[model samples]
Target: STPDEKIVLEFMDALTSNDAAKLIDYFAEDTMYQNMPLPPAYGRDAVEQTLAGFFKVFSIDAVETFHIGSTKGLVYTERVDVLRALPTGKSYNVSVLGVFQLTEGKITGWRDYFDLRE
Candidate 1:
């Protein structure tokens, strides 16, 4: 397993870690994140805004990686983003395809796509 793959999985684990602030610690100062219908987030601060809001509405229980691969510092994951609804206390999983670009173990770019029909 390459370091980039390891680091990306660690970041996924942090989603369920309850250490909200620590989640942003893996990102580079200029990290970019793009998720949902929202536009690309230019930096860690912007990504934090999006994440903090999600943390309030739902919590991730775990990230199930079916296949993880990397080449030249770019890591790809076929993941199941297990989530628990905060308001209803119900759980569901979202199918995801994540492409993460890392430099020296810090995530520089994070992008996630989902199957809306799932």
Candidate 2:
């Protein structure tokens, strides 16, 4: 499999499972993760903390990819992420554009553009 596809799939799969440890495995130690326009999370610890917060409130129900593109060390995706809020079970289908920058098969930067109101 292509490196971009492999890394993206691993990251998304881990996210779906709410596996914080597995999710962080695909990131570099010095990572930049942001759900704009929130402040960016720097480093693996910061990223993991942000991820864990999401895991507490929601579970990824589905990820429907509309487009995926990759270059030497970057990947981009247009996707709809279905998130089911815990306890309440309310679902939100968030349309998003995700851009990732990787180095040596590990993601060094990630940004997701989406309307939070969705």
Candidate 3:
């Protein structure tokens, strides 16, 4: 197991920079990604592929980060998400929390909990 600081930083950096390559660096081969819109993706390759597709449809701007830390094998991040859509730069403030499990410098598991109403 790695230290909390390093593990948390890995996940944070990935989301902050929207770097899919670096993001996948924290997953295991059989990593699981679960959320709405699209179905859950299992395994590292699947997760990366799904995220790539979804990320292309929309971009995110970070308004603020509330908290980040670690518990057990999961790195937790709490922040506000700003949506960057066309037409009018509409801002949607949402609270986000992501749970990441790292194995051998790769993420093997991820659980996300978020609320769009704020």
Candidate 4:
């Protein structure tokens, strides 16, 4: 496992720390992150802004990476994102599939696909 899979996993695994800058640091200068349906974050600043706001509502826990793989320079994962609300203390077991493109050790593109069911 080269850097691609590890780094991509780290972003989601370590996100409970609520350090948006630290998480986004591994991304490229011109990175893009899309959580589908929501408008995409086209750059570092936008990504960080989205993360910051997202963290306000959720604290991650019970994350289980059931499957992960990387091929042809792209990494992907199938996992359960157990996002517990910081305000409500409710847990959302979001099944997510994440696709990532890494360039040299930094993430260039990242997209997450999940159903829009609350």
Judging by lDDT against the true structure, name the best candidate. Answer: 1
Model 4 score (lDDT): 0.83
Identify the superior model by lDDT, candidate 1 or candidate 4: 1
Can you write out model 4's per-residue Cα lDDT over 20-84, one digit (the tens) per residue?
87888878888999998778999988888888898877887767888899877789888887889
lDDT-based ranking, best first?
A: 1, 2, 4, 3
Question: Which window of ten consecutive residues has the lowest lDDT sum in model 2?
Answer: 9-18
Q: Which candidate, 3 or 4, has the higher lDDT? A: 4
Whole-model lDDT per candidate:
0.84, 0.83, 0.69, 0.83
CA displacement after TM-score superposition, residue 43 of candidate 2 (Å): 0.6
- Report the C-alpha lDDT of model 1 over 1-118, residue by residue, as the tens digit: 7878898888876778755578989998889998755689898898888788889988888888798898676899887988899999999988988899988779899888887893
List the lowest-lDDT window of 10 residues for candidate 3: 1-10
Model 2 per-residue lDDT at 1: 47
Return the clash pairs for model 1, or none.
none
Error of 3 at 72 (Å): 2.9
Worst 10 residues of 4 by lDDT: 8-17
Looking at model 4, the pairs that clash are none
How well does candidate 1 match the true structure in TM-score terms? Answer: 0.89
TM-score of each: 0.89, 0.88, 0.75, 0.89
Clashes of 3: 6
